[PDB]
């Protein structure tokens, strides 16, 4: 049972683009987003659906009220490539990855 | 600085006992609720283990009943994860973790070195 | 200690010695054993504050006398003016009215509220 | 235009926080005859008769966020530490012990121990002949012969004896607002853990809660007045704690047979250890009697209450998760000596044949165990020793509440933690009692 | 506890019973544990003394500070009959320090004499 | 600011008396605060009490029924009004102190007859 469906599965983007990842929940828990560089420990990115976590620049943003949540990453830095994970405390999704175009 | 230090990994035969230790470096280990999760290539993550090290409260996932056990020593400030009856599917990196604040007992702040588990089939 | 001199006299003499009694009532002159003085100070201060507060609730601070607006009942004391003023000594009168203590305590919060219907 | 002037005596509120002060009855220096929890510095007598219902008082309550429970918790633990302070230190006991089992299911659990001790003269030595339970002693390194043992504590910390006259059951102790503060009590029986309350009443001082200590169960408490009540932080957060408050009590009795006898033992000049001298009887160990299948009936109602809140994931039950004995077992201090019971029999079974069924057959029995050396408050290092007590010890109590957890999906952290008893913290299970009440202060001024 | 009865009523009825609140506002070896009752009593006494001090500095009382309608334009009848005390208290609480001040000057203008 | 009045003559200081009164009111190692709090509260209570005993509470200045004598001070209106800084006059009257204390009790009682 997956009640956090990240979509699209992956994105291939050049540096400086604006990446968008949608995640769909169906329960009142709330969202957070992880990310780990290849071979590195994960880091919290977005918290509470829209709030940037500590040490996270304004590039990353989140929304919205409802079951669908739209992660967004403006000005794609190459260091931000790798796997992202949708999350809300008791949930996480399948994970999705961003790579070079 | 608060930090989670993981011991070395394992590569042993399947159908074996597998053990890991993690220390909450630079922190009052007794107070905060640690957690264990799995990360593997191309797989969903999976939450493994709860530990409220004050009383030693424990609970764990549906696929892990019986097989998986964990404990702690408050004096050593070290949590211990031990899996029984190792199998090929157990191959994954394991992280001892923590939340942003020790109020929500979920793993969304800290991550160790990701000590790996490998099954020599 | 002069205020106790009025205790040993009739009413009229005590009529002027009211202030001297009021003055002294507030304050006076390894070993952790001695901090019970702080308990005594707190209790004395609380008693004084109770006095001033209660004077406030009659709406009668500053003065020692105030024209308070309530009936009086002879059932509490029917005896005449002269006996209560001339011959009397304070402890005996206080004992006499003490029988009616909560029968002579109560209302005048409402009396204050009554003249405060227009104040 | 309409121009300023100040009231005095305005009845309005501010959600301030302060240090409350308890109130209880008293009859002697140890707070009636003996004392552990009570304190007569908290003045007699019960000022709770000052009660009043109020019109239109809609006010928010939050038991999870309540804080005076924490002040009370610090109060109790500080008082208990102060009680332990004057008593004897059992440091001299930690010497090598030549030990074996009992002399002749059975109290083979008891381990016979012989050891050396100092006489009244500081330099002279004498042998001893003592008895201790297995969990209270550790064998030395197995490279040496296992017959040699030591006390558990001295590898980690010191030891202290409990004074004899310092022994006391939980007294109902009231909690009174200081001047300028007031206590607000909600009366709506359907209180959902937090939210507005409409039938709010106010009291100068609150109910005399008993400072009981227990694990996995609430006993000798106050029943609810609606049907069985559920309270939780947020149910969908699966790994969070759920608390259940019963509307009808269930009886439990705990006993151990035997005319057991203790003996004083010299430890240096001016203080003596209290060891168990002998056990006299059949002494079938520590079995506790439950009030027949009334538990079988009660679990049905609890299952219905849980099913009301959630879709059809069928409710059932499971053994304790594990961990320390306090987490693993239900614990209590009824007989002075502390008790532990494997609660597997309580939570076995799932089907309607014993969850939509009721009958009276025979008292359900729990295997139990006794321990003396204990980290009293749930593992904190206040290591102290409970002396033994004479035989034919017995207890009686009324059960009033349970502790539980919950399951959820997309992390399958739990599929049966709804079905599992929680270990819990006695701080929170006091907070499960103080949900009724709230603290507030006064502000006497305004304009119009 | 009657003053809380006035809390559950509007301005009119509470105007009849302000004094009971003032009455209740004032007062009501090994175990050094309970010594903090003393400092609690001290703090309560200090709150009472602050009340009396503020009452003194103002010199119910025909005072002289005006009242800008920006802080509240709501009419006479609302704040007599309909208004429950907590709501209006919160309403004026937004302007708290904006409406704290010139009563000292109201003393001072008459201290010109 | 009341110390600003200390650094000025009597006339300017006369408009700033209230603020001084306003501010005048308010590890066992840390318990020592209680003594300071109690003593400050007691000083304030002595002030209010003695204001009562002149029959002059509420009012900051009061028409109290004792006269002056040239022995206690002969210096005139103008010097004390304008030129005179507070500490010097306080020291000068302090030479008398207790004799310039006393009699107003029986004058309070005179009006109290």
From TrEMBL, chain D:
GO molecular function: structural molecule activity
GO CC entries: host cell endosome membrane; host cell plasma membrane; membrane; viral envelope; virion membrane
Membrane topology reported for the UniProt record: Peripheral membrane protein; Single-pass type I membrane protein
Post-translational modification comment from the UniProt entry: Palmitoylation of the transmembrane protein and of Env polyprotein (prior to its proteolytic cleavage) is essential for their association with host cell membrane lipid rafts. Palmitoylation is therefore required for envelope trafficking to classical lipid rafts, but not for viral replication.
Keywords: Apoptosis, Clathrin-mediated endocytosis of virus by host, Cleavage on pair of basic residues, Coiled coil, Disulfide bond, Fusion of virus membrane with host endosomal membrane, Fusion of virus membrane with host membrane, Glycoprotein, Host cell membrane, Host endosome, Host membrane, Host-virus interaction, Lipoprotein, Membrane, Palmitate, Signal, Transmembrane, Transmembrane helix, Viral attachment to host cell, Viral envelope protein, Viral immunoevasion, Viral penetration into host cytoplasm, Virion, Virus endocytosis by host, Virus entry into host cell
Subunit structure comment from the entry: The mature envelope protein (Env) consists of a homotrimer of non-covalently associated gp120-gp41 heterodimers. The resulting complex protrudes from the virus surface as a spike. There seems to be as few as 10 spikes on the average virion. Surface protein gp120 interacts with host CD4, CCR5 and CXCR4. Gp120 also interacts with the C-type lectins CD209/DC-SIGN and CLEC4M/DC-SIGNR (collectively referred to as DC-SIGN(R)). Gp120 and gp41 interact with GalCer.
UniProt miscellaneous comment: HIV-1 lineages are divided in three main groups, M (for Major), O (for Outlier), and N (for New, or Non-M, Non-O). The vast majority of strains found worldwide belong to the group M. Group O seems to be endemic to and largely confined to Cameroon and neighboring countries in West Central Africa, where these viruses represent a small minority of HIV-1 strains. The group N is represented by a limited number of isolates from Cameroonian persons. The group M is further subdivided in 9 clades or subtypes (A to D, F to H, J and K).
Record family assignment: Belongs to the HIV-1 env protein family.
Function per UniProt: Transmembrane protein gp41: Acts as a class I viral fusion protein. Under the current model, the protein has at least 3 conformational states: pre-fusion native state, pre-hairpin intermediate state, and post-fusion hairpin state. During fusion of viral and target intracellular membranes, the coiled coil regions (heptad repeats) assume a trimer-of-hairpins structure, positioning the fusion peptide in close proximity to the C-terminal region of the ectodomain. The formation of this structure appears to drive apposition and subsequent fusion of viral and target cell membranes.
Domain free text: Some of the most genetically diverse regions of the viral genome are present in Env. They are called variable regions 1 through 5 (V1 through V5). Coreceptor usage of gp120 is determined mainly by the primary structure of the third variable region (V3) in the outer domain of gp120. The sequence of V3 determines which coreceptor, CCR5 and/or CXCR4 (corresponding to R5/macrophage, X4/T cell and R5X4/T cell and macrophage tropism), is used to trigger the fusion potential of the Env complex, and hence which cells the virus can infect. Binding to CCR5 involves a region adjacent in addition to V3. The CD4-binding region is targeted by the antibody b12.
Protein name: Envelope glycoprotein gp160
Organism: Human immunodeficiency virus type 1 (HIV-1)
Entire protein: shown range: 33 to 488 of 854
